[PDB]
């Protein structure tokens, strides 16, 4: 059982842990830190996918193309603030 599965996550806890360790952000990385961060990244990805997917489906499409992403982000105040513009 992977750490991701242990935490109920789809995003990769192990990979995120190694990215944290390898980036030398601190002397040590606590075992909870990559689990928390992974969950946050998965959440943000899920939010963006939801809204881009909405934009695609609103456009009678079944495949997200970059204009769907651009519009999803632009039309969401908080994601627009977070991610600038695409």
């Amino acid at each position: 059982q992977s750490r991701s599965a242990k935490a109920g996550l789809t995003f990769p806890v192990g990979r995120v842990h190694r990215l944290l360790r390898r980036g030398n952000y601190a002397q040590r990385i606590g075992s909870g830190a990559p689990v928390y961060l992974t969950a946050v990244l998965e959440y943000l990805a899920a939010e963006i996918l939801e809204l881009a997917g909405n934009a695609a489906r609103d456009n009678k499409k079944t495949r997200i193309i970059p204009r769907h992403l651009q519009l999803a982000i632009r039309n969401d105040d908080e994601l627009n603030k977070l991610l600038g513009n695409v």
């Binding site: 909870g32 830190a33 990805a45």
Partner: protein, 98 residues
Amino acid sequence: MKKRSKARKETYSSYIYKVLKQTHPDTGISQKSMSILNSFVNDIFERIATEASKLAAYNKKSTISAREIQTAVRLILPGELAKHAVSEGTRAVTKYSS
């Protein structure tokens, strides 16, 4: 071994596809859209990790724990995004430790 001539693997892309599949299996995502979304996730990773680094240093901690990630998330994400992210982070750590 991975040589320079080989295209870089996108860190999150296979997981982004899985997340999309979970919620809406009838919606796909183009390669360019995936690359853009992958870069967003890389960007946010780096912003949070960097802020957690600075918080650990500021608070005289040698270790970045879930506590520093939480406060970094709240410093980086706006409003309701922050609140939901914190919920999800907290929920994952609890489930992990159970």
